[PDB]
Amino acid sequence: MIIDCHGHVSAPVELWAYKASLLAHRGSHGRGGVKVTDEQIIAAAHHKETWPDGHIELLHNHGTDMQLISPRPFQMMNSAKPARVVHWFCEEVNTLIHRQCTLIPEMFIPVAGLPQVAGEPIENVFAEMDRCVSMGFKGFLLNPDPYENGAEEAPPLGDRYWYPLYEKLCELDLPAHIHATGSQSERSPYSLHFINEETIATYNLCTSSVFDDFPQLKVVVSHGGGAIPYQLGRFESQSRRSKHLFSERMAKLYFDTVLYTEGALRLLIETVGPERCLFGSECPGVGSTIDPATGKQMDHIAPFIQKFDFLSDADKKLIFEDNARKVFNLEV
Amino acid sequence: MIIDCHGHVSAPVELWAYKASLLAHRGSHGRGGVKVTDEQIIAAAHHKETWPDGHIELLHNHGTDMQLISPRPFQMMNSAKPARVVHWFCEEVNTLIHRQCTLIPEMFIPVAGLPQVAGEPIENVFAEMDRCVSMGFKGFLLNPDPYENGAEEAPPLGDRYWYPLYEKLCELDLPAHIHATGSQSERSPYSLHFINEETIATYNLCTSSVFDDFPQLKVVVSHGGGAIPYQLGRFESQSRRSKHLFSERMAKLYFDTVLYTEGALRLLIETVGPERCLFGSECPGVGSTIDPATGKQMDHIAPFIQKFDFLSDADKKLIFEDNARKVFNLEV
Amino acid sequence: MIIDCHGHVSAPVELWAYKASLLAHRGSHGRGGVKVTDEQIIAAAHHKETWPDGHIELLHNHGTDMQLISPRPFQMMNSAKPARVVHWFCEEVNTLIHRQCTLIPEMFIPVAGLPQVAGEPIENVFAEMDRCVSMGFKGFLLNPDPYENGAEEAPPLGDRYWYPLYEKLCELDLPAHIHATGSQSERSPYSLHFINEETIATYNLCTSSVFDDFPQLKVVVSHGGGAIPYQLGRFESQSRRSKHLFSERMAKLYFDTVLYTEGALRLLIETVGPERCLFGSECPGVGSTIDPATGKQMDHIAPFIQKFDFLSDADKKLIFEDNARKVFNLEVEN
Amino acid sequence: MIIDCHGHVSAPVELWAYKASLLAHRGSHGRGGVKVTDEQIIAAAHHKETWPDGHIELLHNHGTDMQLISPRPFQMMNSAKPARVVHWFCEEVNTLIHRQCTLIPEMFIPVAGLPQVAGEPIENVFAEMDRCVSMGFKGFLLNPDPYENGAEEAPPLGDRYWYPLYEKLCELDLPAHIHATGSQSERSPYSLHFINEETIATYNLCTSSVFDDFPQLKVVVSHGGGAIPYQLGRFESQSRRSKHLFSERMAKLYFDTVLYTEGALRLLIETVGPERCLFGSECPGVGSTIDPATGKQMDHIAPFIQKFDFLSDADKKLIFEDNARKVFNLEVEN
Amino acid sequence: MIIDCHGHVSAPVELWAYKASLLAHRGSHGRGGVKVTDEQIIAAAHHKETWPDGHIELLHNHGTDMQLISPRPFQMMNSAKPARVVHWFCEEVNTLIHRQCTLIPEMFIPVAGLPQVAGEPIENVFAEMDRCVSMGFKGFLLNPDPYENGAEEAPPLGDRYWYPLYEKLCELDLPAHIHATGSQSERSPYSLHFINEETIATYNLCTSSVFDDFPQLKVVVSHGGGAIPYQLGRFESQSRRSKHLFSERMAKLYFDTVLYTEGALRLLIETVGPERCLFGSECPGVGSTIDPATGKQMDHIAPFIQKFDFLSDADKKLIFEDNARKVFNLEV
Amino acid sequence: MIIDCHGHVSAPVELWAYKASLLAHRGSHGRGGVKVTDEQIIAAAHHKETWPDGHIELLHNHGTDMQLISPRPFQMMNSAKPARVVHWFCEEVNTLIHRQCTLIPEMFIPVAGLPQVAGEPIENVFAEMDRCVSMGFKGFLLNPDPYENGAEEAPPLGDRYWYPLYEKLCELDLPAHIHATGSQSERSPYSLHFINEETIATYNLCTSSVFDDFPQLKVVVSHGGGAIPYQLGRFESQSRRSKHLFSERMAKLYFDTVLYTEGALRLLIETVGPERCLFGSECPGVGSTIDPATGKQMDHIAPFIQKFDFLSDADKKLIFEDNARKVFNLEV
Ligand SMILES: [Cl-]
Ligand SMILES: [Cl-]
Ligand SMILES: [Zn+2]
Ligand SMILES: [Zn+2]
Ligand SMILES: [Zn+2]
Ligand SMILES: [Zn+2]
Ligand SMILES: [Zn+2]
Ligand SMILES: [Zn+2]
C-alpha cells in the first residue's frame, strides 16, 4: 500500500473564519469554537478548492491509500497575540482533524499541531499533546521558528529549552514532524521559509547532542530536509574538525519525500537511504499544478520512486508504508 | 585549463588585525591603512595555516591553474557601526587583493567586495566599484543580507532598492557573485547562513522582473544555488500562475559548483546545464579536510566533473574555463 | 418609514476565511479575492448564526424598513501588516456590501469602510473612496484609531493630517460615520474601545477648528457619542476661554441612537435635539439579546423613541427618517 | 449636612515647586521635603488664584459643610522616573493634606494618594497606606493607569496583580476612590483621560470576580462612572452568558456625582439609585466656571439634586451625607 | 570692579511650580504664564533659600559688583515632552530674568536660556534668541546634551547641525556659554554631568573646524573647562598626529573660573592665560557651603585670584571685569 | 628604582587578528586560541611600530626599570556579542601577557583584564580572576562602563552589583585599576571617554559607602583621576551634608600619574599627596609624541616628578616604587 505521511487538512471554511474572528475580538467573546456538522466536514474533503480535484479524489487518482493529515502550518500563527488565541485555534484545528479522521477512517490518519507560542516554555504544549494522544493522534508538527521570521528567534533545537519535549516524545514513542509555519518577511515568504527552517532545524539536530541524550527520538524532517542533503558535503567537512560527524547524527533522522523533481528525489534517497525516507506529497497543495509538457500533476510523485531501478521492492515498501507504520506507530 | 571562480583571499594577519583596530577606535584614529610588505603578502598565499598545505600548493595539487579570489565574506561586517569602518575595511581588503594578484599573477584574479552598509542606499558602493574597475577587478560579491541575520533585513533582490546596482553592473558588463557575509544568529552560524541566503537571493531573482528589466545582468550564485536546484520543483509549481515561470528566470542565472558531494554536483549540472555552471571550490576553506575513506581533500572536486559521462569534453570546458572567461571577462 | 443608519454587514463565512488567508500568506499569493456567489451573499443576510434569527427577519420583526450597512469594524485590522492586506481586505468587504445591497435593495443601503493603515497619509484612502462613490455608497466609516489601541496613536481629528479627508468629504457632500475598529488592549476590549474612541473623536472635533474650516462637513458619531452627552458639562466648562464653546462646535455633529437603555436615549435626544439624532440600532450585533423586561431584543430600541412624550411626531420623523435622508444623501427610493 | 466626597487639595505653591525640583535633580539631592508653615497651608485654602474665589469660600457659598480632599491627581506623575520621586512626592502630598485637615478640621477630611509606580507590584503602596491610616485618612485614590496613557498599560482591575490591595482595603474597611492621573497622549488630555479610565476601571470590575472574591470591598467611581451609566445597555447585553450580569456586579459599586449637567445627574441617580451615589463636586476645579444660565458655578450642583422631585428627602440625605459617612468611615464630628 | 559671569536666577517659587503644572497638564491648559509681582521678584533676590544668606547679600559680602544671571540649567528639561513645554518654560524663565534685571539693574545682567528640544533643528531656538536680544540679553547658555544623558545623544559641536547657531551668534556678536542641563543617569547626577559635558564640548570644539569657519565665535566654557585644562597633555599629544594642534583651537575659547580650590584656579589660569579667563562663581549654589577649617564660603573665590602673585594688576582686571565686558558686550 | 604602574601590552599582530576572527565567526569555529611563538612575542615588545622606538627601548630611554602591563583596554569590547567571545578574548589576552612577562621578566609585570560582559553579574569574572591569580597576576583592570558608551549603563560603583567583586579583591588583597574600554559615541571617542569614566567611577566611590564597607579595598584610578582633582572643590562642597565628606572617602583612593603636563602632575600630587600617587605613563601610547619645543617625548614624565622641590626624596621613592610595591604586592 501507499501511505502519504505529509498532508494537510481540507477543512470547512468555518475553521479559517473562526481564526479571523478570534484575532478580531482577541478572546473578548471567550473561546467559543468551530460549529460545523459532520456532513460539512466530509464535504470539505471532496471539494475542489483551488486544486484540480477534491482531496479524496486526488489521493485516489494518485494511488495513495492513506494520508496523515496535520494542520495547515501557514495558518497556525505562532507569533500572534494574545497567546490564548494561538492555543485555542490549535486546539480547534486538532479537534476538527480528529472528527474528519473518525468520519473518513479509510483514508485519513490524524497528526496534531502543537500550540507553540513564541517565547513560551515548551511545557505549555504538553496538555494539548495529552488530549491529542487520547484522541489517537500519531505524531506532532514541530515548529523550529514559532517567532515566524520575526525580529527574534527561538533557541536552536539542541538547546535545553526543547529537552522537555524530546523527553515527552520519547515517553509517548511518537514523532516530531519538523514544519515551520508563517513568515513575517517580505524577502522570504512562507513557502520558501519552510525550506530554510528545515535546513536550520536539521543542522541544529546534527551538530548537537540531542540524539546522544534521546537515542530513540523520532524526527521526520519535511521537504527532503530543506537544503541539507544537497549541501551535506560542506557540513560533513566542517564536522570532521569536531566531536561527531554530521553524517552520524543525520543517520538518526527521517526525511519525507515532498520533493517534486525526479533528480531531487534520487539525491535524497541515495543520500539518506530507503530506511530513512517516508513517502509524502503535500497533495493537495503547493505541488497541485500540471506540468504542461507531461500533463502530470507535480505532486504525483509515487511513480518516480516506483520506477527507480536502484531500489529493491523491499526498499520501495519501506518508503511507501513500512517506515511510516513504524515512525507514526500505525497499527494494522 | 581550470579556472576556479570561487576563492577567498589568503591575507597576511595584519589585515584582520587592522579590522580589530578599526572596530576598537571606530575611526577616532583616522582611516589609516594596512601596513604590510610584499614578502608578507606572498608568504600568506604559501602559509600552511590550518589546511594540509598552502593556498598556492593546494591549487597546484588539485590541477587548478587560476583562481578568482575575493574577500573572506564572513569578515566583511556589513552590519557593523559606524558605517565608515565598513567602507574603509572593504576598501583595504580590495587593495590587498589587488596587491596579491599583482604579486602572484600566475594564479590569482581579483574580485571585489562591495562596501555594503546595512540600511545605506546601494549607490553608496559605486565609488568603490569604479575604483576597483580601474584596478582591473573582474566582478563583485553581492550580499543579499548586509544586516547579517539581524532584527531587520534588506529589501528582496527584486526591489528597486537594488536596481541602481543592476544598472551599473550592466554598464560595466561585470557580474555580481551572490555571497552572504556574517550571521548574528545563535541558530544559524555563518556557514549555514550562506546557504539560506543563496536560497532567498535566487528565489527573489526568479520571482521578480529583474531579468525582464536587465536581460544582460550577470549573476553567479554561490554554492550551487543554496537549496534551489534541490527544491526547484515546489517553486516552479507555485510560479505556474505568474508572468514567467520560475525556471524561465532561473535560466538567466549562473551557478558555481562549490558542492562537495558527487550527487549534488550531478544534480546541479543536470538541473541548470553545463552552460550555466562555473567550476568553483572555495579551496582552501571549510572543504579542506581529508576524507579518510579516500585520502582526498573534500574540496578537490574537479575529478568528479571530469568523470561525469553525461558531459561532453566541450561541456566540461564550459564548466572549467569558458563560462568564467565570459562571465568575468577574462582575457587570454 | 424607519431607516436604521448603523448596521454592519452579515457576510458569508468565505469573507472572514479570506481575511485569515491574507494574514497567513501576507499577500504572497497575490491579492486574489473573495469567491462567493450571489446566492451565498443573500443566504448570509437571512442566516440565524449567532443571533436569535436572521438579519433581515430581525429588521422586519422590529419594523425597520431599511438599514445602512457598513463593514464589521472589529474585523478591519487597521494595524495589521503588511499594509497591502489592510487595503485588499477593505476593498473586498466594500465590494461584498455593494453586491449584497444590489441583491437586496429594498433592505440595504451601502456604507463604505476606509482602508486606513496606521501611519499612512489619509490620502491613501482616496482611490477606494472614489470607487465606492462610483458604486453608489452613501457614507464612510472613519476610524480615529487605526493603531487599534497600540503603543502609538494617530493625530487627533483636529490635526491637519486629516484635513485632506474633510476636504474630500465636503467635495462629495458625504458623511463620515465615526467608528473605531479593534483593540489590542487586555484591559479595554473592542466593544468598550468603541466608546472611548467615540469620546476622544468627539472631544477633538469640538475643541478644534474643523467645523470653522469645514462648515458643511457631515459627521455622525456612533453610539450616542460615547461618553460625551453624559460628560458634556465638564468639557463645556473648560472651553469657556476658547474660540468657541464646546457646545457650539458640538451643535454641528450628528449622533446615532445606538444606545440600549431608555434613560440614555432620553439624555442623548434632550442634549443634542432631534435635529441631530439619527436612529441606529446595530441590529444584529452587541444588542441582539432578549431584554427580560420586554421579551424583545435590547437593540429593538425604536419603541422607546416612539413613546417619548416630549418629542413631536415631526421630531420622531427626523430621528427615524429625515435626518438619515439628508445626511447620507438618500434619494426617493422605498 | 452636605459632605462633598470629591475635592482635591489646594496646596501652597511650595508643594508644586518641590515636585519640579525632585524631577530636576532626580533625587540626587536626597529626599528632602516640602518646607511650608501652617500659615502657608491655611492661606492656600483661602487663596483665590485660578478660581473665582478661595477654596473654603466657595464651599461656604455652595453650602457644603465638609469635603474629603485628596491629591490633585494630574500632578501625581505615576509614570515618572526614577521610581523614588513618585513615592517621595506622594508622601509629601499626603503629609500636607494631613496638616491642612488638622489645621482646618471643620472643613476638610483627608483622603490619600497611593504611591503607584507604573510596573511596581501593588504591595509597594502598603507602607504609605499604613502611615496614612495612622494619620487618620479615610480612603485612597486608586489609579487604574499608572502608565499615564503610555505605550504600556497595567493589568485590568480584575487581575490578581491588584488582589493584595483589595485584601488590604477589606482589612482596613476603607474605600478605593477610582481616579486616573495624567495622560501622555496628544489626543486625550488628562480631563478626558479621567473619563475613559473610569469607564475601563468600572468595566473591568463588573466583568471580573473581584466582588465575588471581596464582597465587602468599597469602591467609589469618580465622575458618575465615566461613560458606564450612559453606555450600560451594551455592556449588560454582552454579559448575559457570564457568571453574573454586568448590572449585578455594578450594584456593588458606589459612584460620586461629579457631573455638571442636570440630565447626567438624573441619569446617574436613576441608573444606580440614591443608595449608591455620593455627592461630589470637585470644587474648586474643572467645573469652577460661572454657568451663564444660573449665575452660579457649574460645580454648584447641590441644588440640582435637592430639587429632583423623584427623590425622597431621605434619598437626598443618603446622597448628601449618609453614604459618605458609611463608605469613608466618618464618625460623629461636625 | 568685579563682574561675576556665572550666576543663576533666584526666582519666586511660582516659576518652578509653573514648570510642574506645565508637565502635569502637558499644555492642555495652554501656555498661560508665570504670575508674579515685581515685589515678589525682588523678594526672591533677598531670600536665603538653602544658602547662608540672600543672593544680593552674598554678592555684597563677596565684593561682587554685578553678576550675569541665567536660567538654573538643571531645571530646563531639554529632554521633556511635549516639545512645546520646553519652549514655553524657557521663554517664561527668560522673561522673569529680564524683569528681575530691569528691577535690580545695579546688580544683575541678563543671560538667556535657549529652548533646545532634543532632536529639534537648532534653528528652532532663533525666535527666542531674537526676543531675548530685543530685551537686552547679553549671551546664551548652550547645552551640548539636550538629551540629558539619555539613550541618544546630539551631534558633536563640530557637526554642521550646530552651524546655523554659530552663524547667528556671530551675526549678533553674542557668546555661547556652555552649560549642560539635567541628567537621566543614576551613575552621573547633574552636578557631575555638567563637568563631563563641558569636557566633551570643549574637546569637540578643539578637534573640529568650528573656529576656522567662525573665527569670531565667542564661547565661554563653564567650570574651568570641565576636565580639559587638567587633561590637556594627552589631547595635545594626540593632536600632533593631526591637522591643527588641540592647543591652537583651545586658544580661541574662553573659560569661566567656577572652581572652588586654589590649586585648580591656578592651573586654569596658568594653562589658558588671564586673557581667556572670566571670573565666575555660581554663587549662590553648589559652592555656597562653609569650609569648617577656615570659615570661608567655598564659592568666595575672588580672593584667591586677587592674591595670585604671578598675575599683574592688569591681568586681574582682565579676569574680574574686562573679559566679561568684551565677551558679553557690556556697555559702560 | 622606577616602577611604571600603567602600561598596556605590546602584542604580536596575531592577537588582534584573533579578535577579528572571533567576532566574524562568533564562536561557530570554537574558542580556538592565539597561535604565536616566543620570538614573535619578544619581537612585539621591540618593534618600533608608530612610536619613535620599541616598547622596551622607550622604557630604557626613560629610565623606567619595570612596567606593569595590562590589556589594551580599547580592544576589550565588553559590549560585544555574543558574550562568550568577550570572555574568550579576555582570557587569551591575559595568557599572552603571561607569556610576555615570562619571556621578558626583567621588564614586565602582569596585570589582568576582567571578562566583563555588559549586563552580566560581576561574579562571572571570578573564574578568570582565580586563573590569573594562579599565574602570578598582581592586579585587575576594572571597567565602570562595560556598556561602552551605549544606550544603557551599568550601576554606579557604589551599587551592590559590584560588592561581590570588592569582596574578592579584599580576599586576594589585590587592587582594581579603574580603566574604561571602548566608546560607541560619535561625540566622545574612547580616549576622551576614558577620562569621563574615571571621573564617574571616582565620584561614585567617593559618594557611596564602599570604603566604609571595604576599608582595605585597593583602587587605583587611571589618568590622575579624570577630572576629579581639578573639580574637587565643587564635589567636596556638595558632600558637606553627608555621612562622610567627599575628601574623606577620596583619601582611601590611589591615583596613577598618567598626566602629560607639569601643572597637572603638580596639582594631582598636591591634592592627594605622595602617599596616594603611583608613577604611571602609558608609554608607549597616545603620549609617545615629540614635543618639538624640547625634543622630549610627552609621556617621559618622570623628570617632572624628580624635579618637584616640594617633594622629599622619600616622597619621590613612594611615587616611583614603594606605593606600587605595596598596592600591587610586588616582591623584591
Ligand atoms: Cl457597532
Ligand atoms: Cl477631578
Ligand atoms: Zn507541509
Ligand atoms: Zn565563499
Ligand atoms: Zn457599529
Ligand atoms: Zn478628581
Ligand atoms: Zn551653572
Ligand atoms: Zn591606559
GROMACS .gro file of C-alpha atoms in nm, chain C residues 141-241:
model
  101
  805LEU     CA    1  -1.676   5.478   0.843
  806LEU     CA    2  -1.395   5.691   0.986
  807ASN     CA    3  -1.163   5.531   1.239
  808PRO     CA    4  -0.986   5.775   1.477
  809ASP     CA    5  -0.759   5.494   1.598
  810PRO     CA    6  -0.618   5.290   1.309
  811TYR     CA    7  -0.340   5.189   1.555
  812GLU     CA    8  -0.611   4.980   1.733
  813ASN     CA    9  -0.513   5.065   2.091
  814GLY     CA   10  -0.143   5.007   2.033
  815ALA     CA   11   0.177   5.161   2.160
  816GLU     CA   12   0.126   5.456   1.920
  817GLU     CA   13  -0.176   5.660   1.816
  818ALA     CA   14  -0.287   5.876   1.524
  819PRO     CA   15  -0.308   6.255   1.535
  820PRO     CA   16  -0.625   6.396   1.692
  821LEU     CA   17  -0.907   6.463   1.449
  822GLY     CA   18  -0.829   6.838   1.460
  823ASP     CA   19  -0.482   6.784   1.315
  824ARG     CA   20  -0.412   6.883   0.956
  825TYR     CA   21  -0.323   6.516   0.890
  826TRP     CA   22  -0.700   6.466   0.845
  827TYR     CA   23  -0.778   6.788   0.659
  828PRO     CA   24  -0.743   6.631   0.310
  829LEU     CA   25  -1.015   6.382   0.405
  830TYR     CA   26  -1.252   6.651   0.533
  831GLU     CA   27  -1.199   6.845   0.211
  832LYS     CA   28  -1.289   6.539   0.003
  833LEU     CA   29  -1.597   6.461   0.215
  834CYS     CA   30  -1.718   6.817   0.156
  835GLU     CA   31  -1.649   6.783  -0.218
  836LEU     CA   32  -1.860   6.466  -0.224
  837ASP     CA   33  -2.109   6.603   0.032
  838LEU     CA   34  -2.098   6.263   0.204
  839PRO     CA   35  -2.069   6.189   0.577
  840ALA     CA   36  -1.805   6.033   0.791
  841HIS     CA   37  -1.952   5.794   1.049
  842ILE     CA   38  -1.706   5.781   1.341
  843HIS     CA   39  -1.632   5.421   1.434
  844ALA     CA   40  -1.324   5.261   1.589
  845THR     CA   41  -1.213   4.912   1.486
  846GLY     CA   42  -1.035   4.652   1.703
  847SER     CA   43  -0.830   4.694   2.018
  848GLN     CA   44  -0.501   4.533   2.117
  849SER     CA   45  -0.559   4.601   2.489
  850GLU     CA   46  -0.624   4.337   2.752
  851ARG     CA   47  -0.794   4.600   2.971
  852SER     CA   48  -1.017   4.753   2.705
  853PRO     CA   49  -1.183   4.503   2.465
  854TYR     CA   50  -1.319   4.626   2.135
  855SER     CA   51  -1.679   4.684   2.245
  856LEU     CA   52  -1.554   4.917   2.518
  857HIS     CA   53  -1.282   5.067   2.299
  858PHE     CA   54  -1.558   5.181   2.059
  859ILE     CA   55  -1.699   5.404   2.330
  860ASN     CA   56  -1.372   5.555   2.445
  861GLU     CA   57  -1.269   5.633   2.090
  862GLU     CA   58  -1.602   5.798   2.015
  863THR     CA   59  -1.541   6.015   2.320
  864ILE     CA   60  -1.192   6.117   2.206
  865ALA     CA   61  -1.301   6.177   1.846
  866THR     CA   62  -1.593   6.391   1.957
  867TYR     CA   63  -1.378   6.583   2.203
  868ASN     CA   64  -1.116   6.650   1.934
  869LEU     CA   65  -1.379   6.777   1.689
  870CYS     CA   66  -1.538   7.007   1.948
  871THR     CA   67  -1.207   7.158   2.071
  872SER     CA   68  -1.051   7.222   1.726
  873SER     CA   69  -1.117   7.437   1.417
  874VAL     CA   70  -1.251   7.156   1.195
  875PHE     CA   71  -1.602   7.298   1.170
  876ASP     CA   72  -1.469   7.652   1.135
  877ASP     CA   73  -1.266   7.531   0.836
  878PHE     CA   74  -1.527   7.281   0.704
  879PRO     CA   75  -1.869   7.423   0.799
  880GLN     CA   76  -2.057   7.176   0.575
  881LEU     CA   77  -1.866   6.867   0.690
  882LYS     CA   78  -2.111   6.594   0.794
  883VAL     CA   79  -2.002   6.370   1.083
  884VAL     CA   80  -2.218   6.109   1.257
  885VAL     CA   81  -2.080   5.985   1.590
  886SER     CA   82  -2.161   5.624   1.674
  887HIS     CA   83  -2.326   5.503   1.995
  888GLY     CA   84  -2.479   5.832   2.100
  889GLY     CA   85  -2.139   5.999   2.119
  890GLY     CA   86  -1.953   5.761   2.351
  891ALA     CA   87  -1.939   5.941   2.687
  892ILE     CA   88  -1.984   6.297   2.565
  893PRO     CA   89  -2.357   6.378   2.614
  894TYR     CA   90  -2.328   6.233   2.964
  895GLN     CA   91  -1.998   6.408   3.044
  896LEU     CA   92  -2.071   6.727   2.848
  897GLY     CA   93  -2.070   6.959   3.149
  898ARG     CA   94  -1.702   6.920   3.233
  899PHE     CA   95  -1.588   6.977   2.874
  900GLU     CA   96  -1.816   7.276   2.826
  901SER     CA   97  -1.678   7.431   3.147
  902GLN     CA   98  -1.317   7.412   3.036
  903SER     CA   99  -1.396   7.551   2.687
  904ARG     CA  100  -1.513   7.890   2.812
  905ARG     CA  101  -1.176   8.056   2.737
   0.00000   0.00000   0.00000
